[PDB]
């Protein structure tokens, strides 16, 4: 069984809300907190991307999506 | 026999110039051993257990909250405190509430609010870990001769023998009655790895729930729930199951996060079961690597006369075992004890008997007998017992038989791991090469990537191969293609 | 006068019909106030204080320990625990320790050990923070006219007048007897910012220390020592001031890091002193902005008769004041009251008077009088009072006075900061420009570099100037040179 | 535990002060103390700079900065 | 065997028939000695001490002040004086104060002022240095044979023997009872360097501090505090802890910089502890190079019969020592004086005995016995003691065994320095090469860089490497690159 | 007063040391503790060196020195 959650646009007024009813604050604090768990995972992915991608602009930019997804798998 | 009754059956074969055979008994499996002249035996492992294993961490799955207290202070008049902040078993929180002139403060701006609540696990809502002790494991192994009587998986057979093994046990000798003796020895220290295993238990009074689970040890220590060891009244991290609402001017509310039991049961997907019998704790998976020595085995009834051919009848007609062999039972009306003459003829080849009997020299005796099991070559066959006959067609062909054996071989390898090379005492040099290569490759993959999930294992393998196709050097391209493809070859067997 | 008794003076003068002057009084400074044809005043700030200020953090500078306990467990039987882990005023630590059969253990390996001790501050070694309330600060400002009497620094003068200001006092009117009334208006919101301020108090019993220090608000909240607020019996963070050794198999040692007082007293560096008098807490460094109204001053003695020129005597001969003025005192034996004839002559032209008298219309009264203060041109002069004459030589040169006044100006600017533009202010446009420029540049340096240390600021200023020398664009090179020069002006230009 | 040095643009206010701060005129005494206490080493920094740096102005500035920084880390 | 009770241990083997071994005994460590056909002996260093050592400088940590005076003179009156200015036991300071008519001077300007205060240390606030005398230092070394008994870490083993060494002695023979005689030679040269160590004592009576610290000799003379030698009535440099306020007109304030104890206790971070017990001053660090001669030891009990194989029982099960050896204890009921026939066998091979017994010829005796220690090869094994057996697994690998010995070699080499080459009497040419090279290369870094901080050493090593990359001459480039690498090795080997 | 910190080399041995001291095993944690509070601190030090300095080896060593000195800047 599953009972998946919902967000963003059931948005109530300025009243009280249930525990931690947020997504961006949670994802940012999760992403910045995860870095301590394993340096070699992101460092080796960064090193491979820095060697494999041609042109500095895409070489810098492409990594952001992978790091935004990373804590969903670790 | 037990080997008629369970679907995981396998056959070990040889010649008596080697008297020692290596077996890998798997719990819930069965093995048959056969050789030139010596009788065949059924062998299995019946239970791995301990009495009163060592207790470890207890966890709380449903909080009971009681006796909550609240206090607050005016904006400049210092932070609040309560005596309950310095007692056992109590969860506390501190926050900057709003205050204002209408709520009896002398000033606008932030004040202080503090709240305490007392905590316990609810009765019978515990979860408990247990761990096995290496010096106290008992492994039980059983042997019976292929007697030629038949008994269902219901009554108890009289010819069966049982032996228990512990870290302090020898090359034991089992006296198989009339059939002489068999010798049995165990690598007790090299079965299941007790560094990996915890046995998890909920309360014993539930109906549909399994009695216990074989959870992994590292997983059991990362559980984000309140805990203690035995005899303590305080709970560590009791704040895991309680959270507090954003303050009102002179109140803050505690919220119970509720009974977690379903989240635990939904987390233990794909983890094997275990069971409990008052004080025994049994596993229901795992294996032992073991030696049987055939030195002292004896044949029975070789001096008896042959049956008078007209006095036989079928009692259970020739039928398919589901495991290649054919099985039958006969009733006989002459004098006893005596030898049953058995043969099979391939159609168009009357000069040669093709029956491979799985039981040597079948005999009737005064109390019983008359079960026979045999293997036949594929196609049209005729089976004879005295002057009775029955016609038969044996399914499949030699190529399909080699494939069927190959499938069971891969199923052994993919569940036993590196131990799979011990099955049968084969001295051929290639066994050492295969053993080494699997040990090296399995050790490398497990130490580099072992705990990673199924999807990220696939995504890593595919990404390295695709980068390999994009590389500007052919040697580095081949290295990325090889290292990406190997991960997929090591992992694609799971499912969807 | 008190201006005669102090190391520092500044002079202000109003042109005829000027009703108001703006002053920025500093504690321990004084101002001489004048206007054309009106009597002169001394004005000074006398105290800045409160009765029984509000408390904040208490800190412990020296720990006392009692009643320590220890417990330990073998490598199998889980974590050790003690009752005192769950009580107030305790410090506890838990760690692994080495164990084996030699210590009466079951098995060799890492065990666990736990330790507890009671904590308290040594009886007089507390440090207390106090904070002022803007609703209760009292500022004291005092005025005396130049009556022509003289009174020592350890004597009280009957002509001295006193006023006190809070958030709840308007434009005050002070009466000076025959000289009429003077009007005075404070702006208490312009004083030293309470949000930057705390008062730090140690044990008042020490014969050889200051009683309090004017510590900065942020620094006092970042202190690492153990702490509490008032009325609580327990100490927060008590584990900051004790530490525990490496364990032995059955015991572990607790050590006390000792009295921190010398660390605190060295860490305070250049911070201003403060003092205590029973219930009263005084600052001894700070400033106030105020308006003085020359609205209702009377020149005393314009109706009095002029003295007989012959009956004067010197009571105290002419001397250099050290503020570039001449001071003298005369005694007179004729009828009283009467008005003193005074002039000074350039030694070569007897027709011209050069005496700039700072006490207009000087007189002898029945009870006392006859002090004079004057300023003269550089070089030779003759000074006359009645028919008495004396010969004098005023030191220095006209260039010397503008240099000395320029020095006083710059020294005031680097202590008052952006408020220095209000002193003796008039509606000329430059008063807006100077205050705007200091608001902009001061805001930039305080927000960009305000927390950076003195030698680090010099290293940053040198590095920024060196980037200005090395970089490739001439406009940006000059911008880096100028901005590096500002950081050096805010350090080596403050002192070297 | 450490206590940070307070010294900054303080609540200056022109009155009496506790003991005045270790500015440049005091800091040079720490340099002289280290030059005396560590005497045998002091030639090494000068000798290396004299071999390695071209131009007398940057050579002197590098030596002056090195000797000024040394007693803050030694 | 005390070496079972300790977490640092080492093993030495005499090469066949060699009479002498060289041991670098290291304080709180232990060594187990072995040779062909001879009993095994444990040797360790128990204390380094002296009675009533030589007393050097004393320092004052907390000044106490009395009898303050001040005197001042009017401007141009000529400088002030007080009787105390010439005396011992007082601090005096002289300065200029501003004066004028408001405070009873004749002329305005700079006057002169002088102030005096008497100085003492508070009654128990001293710090005292002590120094060792080469003519009086005593070393205690202890020896016990492996008797095959076991005795707790808190019980008096009767087989233990002790020898005391001083520079007035060198050699001793210890009788071991039945095991014969053992010979020991010590030198007080190549001990801990008495010329570079000082023992620092505070108040001995504080319950929660170490009694003493092993400070370096240069340190205790580079300090800046008030100081004296023994018996003197007045302190040198008392101006180090008293400082004075800027003058008022006719007063100066005297201030006390307070108790320095916490500043000193912070500054000694990383120095090893020492202890004072009665009149004795023990060190708790150090090493001694000793020579052990094994000519006259005897194997006890080679003449006895073997036990009845049926009568053995376990008293402790086979258990891992943590030093990569197996230990066990056995109980028996036959006629007591007989040999125990211990052996072990590797799985997959015949009964070639793989057990290297570290205690040779184990027996029971009428008084006790029955403890054994052995070493085994990696993997699956079985150990036998008459009819008793136990299965076993030994951890690790043949490569891991070499790496583990390599680490302990590197630990000794860095901790003991140049003396580490003297371990083991096989004095081949590489041992003399190592001794020479370590004397030269270590002497260079310890004399050139020794006193510099850990970070600025690393920054210098980096700078010499950075410059080495930029040099145009290849010989100078390689020399600079090597020198940077050497400074990094000389630091980072001690960095963790 | 200014009692210095005792040197880390002298009187090395196996006995109890009084407190943990200040070798690189400690200092590396102090550098990370400065950075994870002052999250932007390394950005300019890495970026300006990567833009301005030729040769990877001297560029990397300059970045390493600029970060190793960091907790002494205030
Ligand atoms: C999920 C709960 C399964 C319970 C069960 O019934 O588990 C049994 C035992 O699973 C296992 O040994 C799987 C062990 C995996 C590690 C299902 O396989 P099986 O009854 O054929 O016994 C095992 C027959 N092998 C050994 C030929 C598969
Ligand atoms: C299919 C059933 C066996 C799965 C299995 O053996 O899967 C893995 C892979 O093991 C191997 O030797 C792979 C050898 C490859 C060569 C081990 O188990 P696991 O870590 O995934 O699960 C926890 C452990 N249990 C399943 C025993 C409870
Ligand atoms: C140039 C000297 C001008 C007169 C003077 O000495 O000007 C100084 C003012 O400029 C300085 O300090 C900076 C002088 C830099 C040279 C003292 O002027 P003041 O005593 O009237 O202070 C109040 C004067 N505000 C209202 C204009 C600030
Ligand atoms: C560039 C920033 C100039 C700020 C400024 O002109 O600030 C001036 C000092 O300017 C200079 O000496 C340099 C002027 C030339 C540039 C006033 O601030 P202060 O720190 O000297 O005042 C004392 C500190 N209280 C206000 C917090 C007590
Ligand atoms: C295990 C293999 C040797 C490990 C080791 O590095 O051992 C080292 C020696 O070898 C090395 O390469 C040292 C390289 C660094 C210098 C320590 O030898 P040791 O602990 O026996 O000290 C006594 C050694 N004498 C018998 C030769 C005196
Ligand atoms: C881990 C580091 C092992 C090497 C080591 O520790 O090497 C150092 C320096 O390298 C060498 O001697 C290398 C050449 C050897 C021939 C050994 O001598 P040391 O500098 O520690 O001085 C003596 C020891 N005290 C500091 C404890 C007194």
Residue numbers in the entry:
A (entry chain F), D (entry chain D), F (entry chain E): 1 to 74
B (entry chain C), C (entry chain A), E (entry chain B): 1 to 496
Give excerpts from the publication.
The E protein is a class II fusion protein and the largest of the structural proteins. The prM protein is a precursor that is cleaved by the host cell protease furin into mature M protein and a pr peptide.
Langat virus (LGTV) is a tick isolate with naturally low pathogenicity in mice. It has approximately 85% amino acid identity with TBEV and is often used in research as a biosafety level 2 model virus of more pathogenic tick-borne flaviviruses. The electron micrographs of virus preparations contained mainly intact spherical virions with a size of ~50 nm in diameter, along with some broken particles. We generated a 3.22 Å resolution map of LGTVT:prME and a 3.82 Å resolution map of LGTV. The main complex-type glycan was biantennary digalactosylated with core fucosylation, including GlcNAc with core fucosylation, whereas the LGTV and LGTVT:prME resolve only the innermost GlcNAc of the N-linked glycan at position N154.
